[PDB]
Amino acid sequence: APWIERRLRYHPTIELPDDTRGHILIFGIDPITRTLIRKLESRNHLFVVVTDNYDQALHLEEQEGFKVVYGSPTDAHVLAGLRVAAARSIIANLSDPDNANLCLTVRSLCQTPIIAVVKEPVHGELLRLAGANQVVPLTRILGRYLGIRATTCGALAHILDSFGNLQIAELPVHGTPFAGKTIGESGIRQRTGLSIIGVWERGSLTTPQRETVLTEQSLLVLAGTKSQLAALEYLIGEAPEDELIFIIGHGRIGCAAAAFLDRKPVPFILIDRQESPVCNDHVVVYGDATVGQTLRQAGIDRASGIIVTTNDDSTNIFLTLACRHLHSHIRIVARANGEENVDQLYAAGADFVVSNASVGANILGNLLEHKESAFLSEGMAVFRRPLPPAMAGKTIAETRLRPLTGCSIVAIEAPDRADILISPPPETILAEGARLILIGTSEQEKTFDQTIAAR
Amino acid sequence: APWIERRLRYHPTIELPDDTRGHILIFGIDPITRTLIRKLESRNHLFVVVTDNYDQALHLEEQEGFKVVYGSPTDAHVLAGLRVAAARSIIANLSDPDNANLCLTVRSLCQTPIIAVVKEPVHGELLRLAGANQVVPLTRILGRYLGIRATTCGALAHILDSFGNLQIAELPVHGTPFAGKTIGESGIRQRTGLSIIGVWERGSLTTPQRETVLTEQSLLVLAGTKSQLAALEYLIGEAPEDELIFIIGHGRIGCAAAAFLDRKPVPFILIDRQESPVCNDHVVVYGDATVGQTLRQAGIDRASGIIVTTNDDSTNIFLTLACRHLHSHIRIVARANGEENVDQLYAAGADFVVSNASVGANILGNLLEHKESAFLSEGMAVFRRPLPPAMAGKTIAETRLRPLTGCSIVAIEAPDRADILISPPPETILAEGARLILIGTSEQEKTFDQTIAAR
Amino acid sequence: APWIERRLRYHPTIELPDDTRGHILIFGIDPITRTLIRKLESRNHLFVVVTDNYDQALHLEEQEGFKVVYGSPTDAHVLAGLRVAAARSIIANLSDPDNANLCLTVRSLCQTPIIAVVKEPVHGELLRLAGANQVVPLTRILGRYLGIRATTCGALAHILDSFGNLQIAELPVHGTPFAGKTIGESGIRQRTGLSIIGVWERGSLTTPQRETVLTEQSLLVLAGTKSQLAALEYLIGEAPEDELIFIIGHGRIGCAAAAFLDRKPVPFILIDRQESPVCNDHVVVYGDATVGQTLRQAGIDRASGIIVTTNDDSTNIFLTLACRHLHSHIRIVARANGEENVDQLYAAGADFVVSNASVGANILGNLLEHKESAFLSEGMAVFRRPLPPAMAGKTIAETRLRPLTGCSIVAIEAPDRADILISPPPETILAEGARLILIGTSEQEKTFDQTIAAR
Amino acid sequence: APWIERRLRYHPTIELPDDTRGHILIFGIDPITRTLIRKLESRNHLFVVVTDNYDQALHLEEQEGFKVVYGSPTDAHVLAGLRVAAARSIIANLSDPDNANLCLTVRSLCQTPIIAVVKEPVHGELLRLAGANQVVPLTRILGRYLGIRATTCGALAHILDSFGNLQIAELPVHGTPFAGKTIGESGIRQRTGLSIIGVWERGSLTTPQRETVLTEQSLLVLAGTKSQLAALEYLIGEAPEDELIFIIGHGRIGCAAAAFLDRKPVPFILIDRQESPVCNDHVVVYGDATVGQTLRQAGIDRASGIIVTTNDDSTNIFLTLACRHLHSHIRIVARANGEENVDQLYAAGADFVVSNASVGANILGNLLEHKESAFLSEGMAVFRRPLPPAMAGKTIAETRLRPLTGCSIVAIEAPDRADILISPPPETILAEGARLILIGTSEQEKTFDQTIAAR
Ligand SMILES: Nc1ncnc2c1ncn2[C@@H]1O[C@H](COP(=O)(O)O)[C@@H](O)[C@H]1O
Ligand SMILES: Nc1ncnc2c1ncn2[C@@H]1O[C@H](COP(=O)(O)O)[C@@H](O)[C@H]1O
Ligand SMILES: Nc1ncnc2c1ncn2[C@@H]1O[C@H](COP(=O)(O)O)[C@@H](O)[C@H]1O
Ligand SMILES: Nc1ncnc2c1ncn2[C@@H]1O[C@H](COP(=O)(O)O)[C@@H](O)[C@H]1O
Ligand SMILES: [Ca+2]
Ligand SMILES: [Ca+2]
Ligand SMILES: [Ca+2]
Ligand SMILES: [Ca+2]
Ligand SMILES: [Zn+2]
Ligand SMILES: [Zn+2]
Ligand SMILES: [Zn+2]
Ligand SMILES: [Zn+2]
């Protein structure tokens, strides 16, 4: 066995057997890709994590879920041994230069798809050029999610502007009037005309029922026109005269959150242990937040909210304990670097925990699992239309919309106050006065109305 | 055999059997904790150290007295492996943030008692909030027991005010007209009106006897009123003018020492290589002290006492030789980080040695072997009542001091020149002018002043 | 048993077996020397790499082409066990100081030929003194080869001045009126009278046919008078103004390129993370090129070309992409250290790539297995003569030049548009109007014309 | 089965056989110490090296001549393990503080001898107190022997002034008129009246004879009067007009050389890269000597001598070469850290070479067996007398000189113009007119003439 075997001097694996197919191979093991493995164990997937650190290989070889290979990720010969042409997907999670090198190298050998994690927003373009076909600015995203949760009140965070008509935004419920209520009694479609595409609750995008009661923690995906969204901003109200978010840590994430807050102009103060060599736009206070007066003197006592974004979890927990114990009114949003700390961050007294490991693994998994659906929608228009009077009663197949307009239907919201139906089967009876959501070419969107009217 | 397994490639124990009850597990092994294990080796309990350092685990594997488990100690899955819920207790000797994390984690799984060693006294509150049943500011204690021994004479050093009630104080008998004299020709009981709880020698509190000779090293434990303690302050005599104390090493222990000396107003000078990343109150003279030209320039020639407080014991020894060579009169107090450097620090000519491990291990070891005896000692007051007129010369168990108000006597004093008895068995005959030293509830002692006068 | 000894505890080879002869040993293993061992695998040369690093020995054992010895290069006993006397030749690729030590130690034992790589051009002399037969300033060569490529246009780069008459020049084609033309169409010889000895294409020296298409990657190797080079210079046209070159990386190679560009007065700018521990002659801008505005604010906007000379390949790949992307018109020469990246650098958008490992291992290759011709080409002349009329139609041997003049024909250039013939065989028939290129001594050169006429 | 233990996982020894006697044990291995074991290999003594570093124990194990033991050198229970009380003697070659700590710890267990290498002259006193019997400032000695050899012509150098009658001093023979002519044909013995005690050559010493030839390499050891040294100094002839010595490397040993050359006021320049953590007394030109400019610009053109005193031999060798080449006249003294580099230093061009390994090992060896000859030698005022008339023609077996005065003759200067006898046996015939160097007391020197003649 390899049982008896591995009690002898250790040697790493260098290459994979020739018949290796449909494996996913990971470059840049960390808590986000470790979570991605664990999470995709419902499928008998094969994960190959590649390390060029001989010492790392040794330790990973005792962990299950995945196979470790040792070798230089940027040498064609190593990649060839990994059977990159035969692989299902490739996850590029290295430094940005190392990723470009990785891409270009594999791209010289095959077209196997690559999802790359980009550490600097502006680098995304470059990783595409190098041949990544999917580029996830994880730290930008993780920042945004901190930014969103941090305000006293919670406003609209824009997600999509589809060709200057239909818009998609999210809305945290916390400061809002809608907190502790049902989706029905909140009166959103009734006051605004907006559609509620869904609800985030635990990285789970749930179809929103009428009876569903939303918490302080609920995040509401919404679609509508710019004007409609405005009507909604009016309803939530305006923020406190003097809110001030205080961001502990100005690493790549803290920087992102800061960059988020600056757009909806929200004042913030930043603490870091270090001048941090990428940012030239944010004025930072230097010190160890862990040290006594550091925080008080930096003026944490004027803050309406705190964002705990240290690369160390023990620290994040500690700062949470401290800020809650000292300033028990302030809203605290904390970053969880590993998923095995998320609970302690709550225990310590955080209001929300952005769980990096989950959020990341979650995005990656979806890009893997829903590859085709994502592709099929690239560059397409999403728009909303009142059902044409002469189509009421009809079934979806009966309207013949795709063959006549090119556009098809992806969601219907019922005429009555009734939950949204996403991905309706073609045998769906189109009700009295429902609104429908349609994906189509943007050119065909411009034209849809004209053809429906023509017939 | 694990003698043959010793010789094959190393693999670390990662968890504990299911049948593992009453074990004592330790987080952050160090001189203090290694000493603890050695000390309570007679009390038949298995000790378990936990490290996330692979190599440390290796080197500790071969060590006797305790076994090693290699795992991230802030992880619930690891903790479960360790069978925390089934442990006797936990020693949390990690960093402060790391302690808070380990704390909140073990609380979400179980209720097992946790003694926490605290790096910064201020953080004491937070770690109780984190879930610690007990919290120990060791450095402040070690910083205290240094300064105590630094003064030429040695004065009152307060341990606790029982809130208006009698108070507990320690007295180093070195520069006192009580040095050399046995208990009685000192006359503390007779001519002051105080009680001698115990005498420390080399880190162990003894039965104070009439014949026991006080030396320089002897440290007394005292109980009495505000005016009773101040009655002995003049009995010591005048502590000579021109009193300045040099402390070498302004780390945490060094800093603690300085701040102690500044409470009972006493001047000192601080020397260190590096600027403290923690302290900002004390002005430090900078330079290596091993080079003698630096100490000289600092005015060490106008000093009455030295405190040697360095991370390295080999240096501490060397500095003690350097001084006893120059100033053969000066009071030198040295700190030993290890226990195996104590005798050499004496041999070099130190007047008292504060053994970091000996002191540390005592404080823990006691909290352990008196766990459900000193835990409800949080908020309790200690008091001394006279012997009742009607209940004179009758048995203690019969007096019914538990089923009257709710009181309990931990020690009793004798009227004649007869030796005191600490924690005595419940069958002894009382006497004439005796004084009872009890512990109780902060509202039961108030009742006793009229309860024993009515019942 | 060779594969079982692999699974036991590691012990390195200390010495070669006594009977070892004719082997090539290498001190200072790196990409260049590793490419060397690959390139000369056609020959059954035995390579032994020596290392004083215990760990480096381990990871090189399981590597093919060469065997590893663990010892101190500069211990006379280590060399003795390495059988240095019996060795074919030695490569010195340590630091200058260690090289010097190595050579002196080696000379202490034997006369075995040493080829030494010289980090510092000025230290060339010192290493020859030390015992080294051949001295290679690889950093300077690589520096020069970047500089040649980096100009907007490409100009003559002198290589040899053989006793003040026949000259040898290099000429990169890229900017010139020859790019895209065949050698024939270029009209060089027609208008110049230069001999085209060669074309470098991909590190490979090719024979110039009249119909080989010169591309932008092509490096002509020319032979001729100073006035003839002067003529070619006139034909290339005037260089364009505002030429300014950005050199990213200012370690040895960048520095070398920079110094090269300084001769033909060519403006440049240097960037580096670090201050140079070696170069006091060069004003340097400071920053990580990788970081965004670093380059912009340094004024890479008005650069005409860019040498990307970092010591890390992924970085240089990243930087080439970045520049090709944001400044597409700007010419880019990039340095590859290690051959597994040359392709990617082209893929990224590099105009030219200079392969340290190729160029290096190539030069070292010729210096090895052309030993008894290389350093016997020391004190030697390269000259050109019209084939003496009488020998037209006679064979080379038939002519008997070597016996008569001591001179060896090395190149025959045929009268008409016909191909140059390099290192022609003795059986070659000499043409009618052919020009000869001969190798001999300066004395032999002088005697030649008389020896031919009078004899 | 030692070749079996070798293939399984490594385990160091942590103690020795319960019956290890007469073993000499070394603390802190380094060149000098590793040489000591080689040098005294002829004597069947067990050498035991002790390191607290693990990897050290690993590598020292596969090395012949000495047994390796892993342990904490300062732990008393480790020392009991080493069986110190039974060892022949102890070499403490740790740092100063560690050395102190060691000494005391062993002094807690036994009365076994200790030779201690000091790093700072001023601390040697502290080490004696600590328990070292013999204390040796190598770095001081080594700096001296470097400065002695650096003078253009070579002057006298004072070893000892014993109370002010007999002076012992050294003389390099390099530039003196005595260079080349045998001890006889220079008449030092004859003209100066000085006792030539020793000639030093290639690190060794034996009895000087008239036929033995003094090369530039030679260093004489002389006993005499202040008038006689003053006579030798005349024979030397004046030092050259303008002379300056450059010292490369202001480390411990470099610094000592500089100090030495201030006694005899000789101008000198110091170069180093780093500031001295120790020396305040010396001005230093800061620069890397290796780099070109550094030396020349620091005015090395006008030097008369150079002392090359770097940590790193390869640097010394390289510098020697560089100097010898630039300055063929200027005399060069170079320091060799390991014996395996000595030969290459001469090869490079060094006029003289000081071998730290030799010089150091000689001293320790002569203190380990002439440990028995340090028992009946030192501290006695070394004095010189002719033979008392009443001892002419009689043996030491008949004279009984030592029990009478208390002095023992360490040198019988032969009757005629005949060679000296050092450490003579007690059966040696004494000749009529003869000089004696006695290392007895000046108790028994001012007593000598009285006692030696009255009986
Ligand atoms: N105690 C602390 N106080 C302030 N900043 C910290 C502390 N610990 C870590 N950091 C910062 O947290 C940031 C983490 O960066 P990133 O992981 O990229 O978001 C770094 O800039 C660290 O300097
Ligand atoms: N020779 C020395 N002179 C002055 N300070 C020192 C020396 N050696 C160590 N230290 C410092 O003494 C401090 C000990 O910290 P603590 O144990 O907390 O008092 C550390 O901060 C060390 O940097
Ligand atoms: N991102 C970067 N930006 C600027 N310079 C760099 C970067 N990375 C490495 N270098 C420098 O490139 C140089 C390469 O050295 P050499 O191999 O001697 O040419 C070194 O001096 C490095 O400090
Ligand atoms: N290239 C160099 N140029 C100048 N000084 C050097 C160089 N290399 C080493 N040194 C110095 O040589 C000294 C050797 O120390 P020691 O062995 O104690 O005499 C050190 O203090 C170094 O700073
Ligand atoms: Ca946790
Ligand atoms: Ca000790
Ligand atoms: Ca590559
Ligand atoms: Ca050598
Ligand atoms: Zn920023
Ligand atoms: Zn302080
Ligand atoms: Zn430069
Ligand atoms: Zn100095």
Numbering used by the authors:
A (entry chain B), B (entry chain C), C (entry chain A), D (entry chain D): 110 to 564
Anything the authors wrote about it?
Our study of GsuK started with the structure determination of its two tandem RCK domains, labeled as RCK1 and RCK2. The two intracellular ligand binding RCK domains form a bi-lobed structure equivalent to the MthK RCK dimer; each lobe consists of the N-terminal two-thirds of the RCK domain (βA to αF) and adopts a Rossmann-fold. In GsuK, the equivalent αG helix is absent in RCK1 and becomes a shorter helix with a different orientation in RCK2, resulting in swapped and loosely packed C-terminal subdomains. The pore-connecting top half of the GsuK gating ring is in a contracted form similar to the closed MthK whereas the bottom half is more expanded, suggesting that the structure likely represents a closed conformation. Furthermore, each subunit also contains a small fragment of the pore-lining inner helix at its N-terminus, which forms a short four-helix bundle atop the center of the gating ring and creates a constriction point at the intracellular end of the pore that would occlude the passage of hydrated K+ ions. The helix bundle is tethered to RCK1 by linkers in an extended configuration, ensuring a tight coupling between the gating ring conformational change and pore opening at the intracellular gate. Indeed, electron density modeled as AMP was observed at the predicted nucleotide binding site in the GsuK gating ring structure. As no nucleotides were added during protein purification or crystallization, the bound nucleotide is likely from the E. coli cells used for protein expression. Two bound metal ions were observed in each GsuK subunit. The second bound ion, identified as Ca2+ based on ligand chemistry and functional assays, is positioned at the inter-subunit assembly interface, a location reminiscent of the Ca2+ bowl in BK channel.
